[PDB]
Design an enzyme around this catalytic site. Structure first.
Site, PDB file in Angstrom:
ATOM      1  N   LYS A  39       0.706  -1.266  -0.007  1.00 33.82           N
ATOM      2  CA  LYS A  39      -0.056  -0.086   0.030  1.00 33.82           C
ATOM      3  C   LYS A  39       0.889   1.176   0.014  1.00 33.82           C
ATOM      4  O   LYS A  39       1.045   1.848   1.179  1.00 33.82           O
ATOM      5  CB  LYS A  39      -0.794  -0.108   1.198  1.00 33.82           C
ATOM      6  CG  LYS A  39      -1.908   1.012   1.412  1.00 33.82           C
ATOM      7  CD  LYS A  39      -3.267   1.218   0.306  1.00 33.82           C
ATOM      8  CE  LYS A  39      -4.152   2.283   0.872  1.00 33.82           C
ATOM      9  NZ  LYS A  39      -5.357   2.051   0.069  1.00 33.82           N
ATOM     10  N   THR A  43      -3.773   7.667   2.758  1.00 36.29           N
ATOM     11  CA  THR A  43      -4.461   8.683   3.571  1.00 36.29           C
ATOM     12  C   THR A  43      -5.353   8.227   4.711  1.00 36.29           C
ATOM     13  O   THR A  43      -5.684   7.239   4.820  1.00 36.29           O
ATOM     14  CB  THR A  43      -5.243   9.665   2.616  1.00 36.29           C
ATOM     15  OG1 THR A  43      -6.365   9.175   1.942  1.00 36.29           O
ATOM     16  CG2 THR A  43      -3.978  10.223   1.517  1.00 36.29           C
ATOM     17  N   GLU A 120      -1.862  -1.754  -3.907  1.00 37.99           N
ATOM     18  CA  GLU A 120      -3.230  -1.190  -3.712  1.00 37.99           C
ATOM     19  C   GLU A 120      -3.041   0.315  -3.773  1.00 37.99           C
ATOM     20  O   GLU A 120      -2.223   0.890  -3.272  1.00 37.99           O
ATOM     21  CB  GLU A 120      -3.968  -1.549  -2.537  1.00 37.99           C
ATOM     22  CG  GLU A 120      -5.326  -0.767  -2.297  1.00 37.99           C
ATOM     23  CD  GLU A 120      -6.023  -1.134  -1.046  1.00 37.99           C
ATOM     24  OE1 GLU A 120      -5.839  -2.218  -0.694  1.00 37.99           O
ATOM     25  OE2 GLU A 120      -6.790  -0.319  -0.595  1.00 37.99           O
ATOM     26  N   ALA A 122      -4.974   4.196  -4.188  1.00 38.25           N
ATOM     27  CA  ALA A 122      -5.794   4.992  -3.208  1.00 38.25           C
ATOM     28  C   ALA A 122      -6.804   5.852  -4.112  1.00 38.25           C
ATOM     29  O   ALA A 122      -6.334   6.553  -4.924  1.00 38.25           O
ATOM     30  CB  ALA A 122      -5.020   5.859  -2.234  1.00 38.25           C
ATOM     31  N   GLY A 155     -25.547   1.748 -10.208  1.00 37.85           N
ATOM     32  CA  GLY A 155     -24.902   2.545 -10.572  1.00 37.85           C
ATOM     33  C   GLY A 155     -23.372   2.094 -11.063  1.00 37.85           C
ATOM     34  O   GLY A 155     -22.358   2.963 -11.734  1.00 37.85           O
ATOM     35  N   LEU A 180     -18.999  -8.415  -5.521  1.00 40.00           N
ATOM     36  CA  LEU A 180     -20.162  -8.905  -5.081  1.00 40.00           C
ATOM     37  C   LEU A 180     -20.302  -9.290  -3.652  1.00 40.00           C
ATOM     38  O   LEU A 180     -19.725 -10.421  -3.217  1.00 40.00           O
ATOM     39  CB  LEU A 180     -20.661  -9.860  -6.027  1.00 40.00           C
ATOM     40  CG  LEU A 180     -22.221 -10.351  -6.027  1.00 40.00           C
ATOM     41  CD1 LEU A 180     -23.251  -9.275  -6.162  1.00 40.00           C
ATOM     42  CD2 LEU A 180     -22.452 -11.328  -6.897  1.00 40.00           C
TER      43      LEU A 180
HETATM   44 MG   LIG Z   1      -8.234  -0.237   0.758  1.00 36.99          MG
END
Ligand SMILES: [Mg+2]
Ligand SMILES: Nc1nc2c(ncn2[C@@H]2O[C@H](COP(=O)(O)OP(=O)(O)OP(=O)(O)O)[C@@H](O)[C@H]2O)c(=O)[nH]1
Ligand SMILES: Nc1nc2c(ncn2[C@@H]2O[C@H](COP(=O)(O)OP(=O)(O)OP(=O)(O)O)[C@@H](O)[C@H]2O)c(=O)[nH]1
Ligand SMILES: [Mg+2]
EC number: 6.3.3.3
Lengths: 224, 224
Positions: A39, A43, A120, A122, A155, A180
């Site tokens: 990561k 924040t 990952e 952000a 959406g 899902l």
């Molecule tokens: Mg996360």
């Protein structure tokens, strides 16, 4: 080759990057594909008082492969403000803009020791990191493959297709996977019928993450 | 020329298309710019039992200019399913695909009798209307200007910029306006600092709807 690298982005904050990343790394590791979770930018954190940020959860998982890892080995720019990284950096660390060349080096160093490096992001693809770069630009610099996680609510069609349009307009390999959630069957009645149609008409289909652990490991590892 | 036409789309359903459309038409009418509100496609409705759909609210406003208007004069494809229009049409009215050539004619006929024709979409830019067309395609066929309404919550940066990327990639005049709700001052601390930066760097700035009634009327009416 050295290890592969997969960037994980999302339609929206809270869509399920971290949950999905951890489930995919767990699956990969159980299949003998040695996988780390990173990561690089986070924040909204206060590490003095809270040990359940994304980086802390990834560290927990990662230490099953390397006890010596610490938080600073897997997360490099960390801010209190709950905002885009650029803004958080400008307010909290005005003399240290985020250096994506440095991050690229640090993240690629893990391809020496791992079969797969999961990164990952952000905020979302268009969220700003520096004045000149967003998360997608960062992913492009990394030369990573991209897994974009979508939410599963009404959406999602619009959100997936907005991201599809941006990603297909850039030179990277990407998949879009819907996270899902348990207890959502409205999805199957409301959104799935269009996903099905889209997939007959597209050379890059939108998948359901939970159905796709094998397919997504294959995607992440294929080729150079 | 005949009247101008402004399409209203959004980052997300519920972002504020209808509220903003009605406030802009009210302002325009108060300035002597005769303005109609149209909702050509609407899902999620049951007109037998509920008279507060978007088309009903627009009809209320519109009758201040023409008592003879009825719902079928301003909304043409209406479905019960709370879904994308394509899906709703396929399930409820399988023998009547939405005809955007017909809609284009009907909407342009109002440019005879109005200075400005406001057309609210549904769902978002990428939401499917027919097998071949989404809301943006419809707006392109109309040759309308575009007003994209954004929500005011964390995430708006990504959402605005995803839409910006799609719109700037097509040949139409557009503005993005944030619907800044009452009681939200987190916006000013969290998101506004980036909006400000973006606007110094972009030839098409993101505005705040509530600050922008005059600017948006100017935009809608300018030129041919
Ligand atoms: Mg996360
Ligand atoms: N699922 C739940 O949905 C919430 C968000 O899931 P995450 O996997 O943390 O989502 P995310 O996309 O990584 O969130 P951010 O990194 O905060 O943007 C968590 O509380 C999960 O347990
Ligand atoms: N503001 C409130 O936020 C809710 C949504 O506002 P709308 O203006 O109806 O939003 P919208 O974008 O037109 O919503 P949809 O047409 O349903 O997508 C309403 O209940 C408003 O009163
Ligand atoms: Mg509406």
């Amino acid at each position: 080759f050295q290890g592969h690298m997969l960037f994980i982005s999302a339609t929206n904050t809270n869509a399920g990057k971290t949950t999905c990343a951890r489930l995919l790394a767990q699956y990969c590791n159980a299949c003998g594909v040695k996988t780390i979770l990173l990561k690089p930018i986070e924040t909204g954190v206060n590490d003095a008082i809270n040990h359940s940020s994304d980086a802390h959860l990834f560290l927990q998982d990662n230490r099953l492969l390397d006890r010596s890892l610490t938080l600073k080995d897997i997360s490099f720019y960390r801010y209190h403000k709950v905002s885009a990284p650029l803004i958080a950096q400008q307010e909290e660390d005005p003399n240290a803009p985020i250096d994506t060349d440095n991050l690229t080096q640090r993240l690629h160093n893990f391809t020496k020791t791992y079969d797969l490096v999961i990164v990952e992001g952000a905020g979302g693809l268009c969220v700003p990191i520096t004045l000149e770069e967003n998360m997608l630009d960062f992913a492009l610099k990394l030369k990573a493959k991209m897994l974009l996680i979508s939410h599963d609510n009404l959406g999602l069609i619009n959100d997936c297709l907005l991201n599809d349009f941006l990603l297909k307009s850039h030179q990277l390999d990407y998949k879009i996977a819907i996270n899902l959630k348990g207890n959502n069957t409205a999805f199957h009645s409301i959104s799935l019928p269009y996903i099905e149609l889209f997939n007959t008409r597209s050379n890059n289909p939108i998948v359901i993450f939970q159905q796709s652990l094998k397919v997504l490991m294959s995607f992440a590892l294929k080729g150079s």
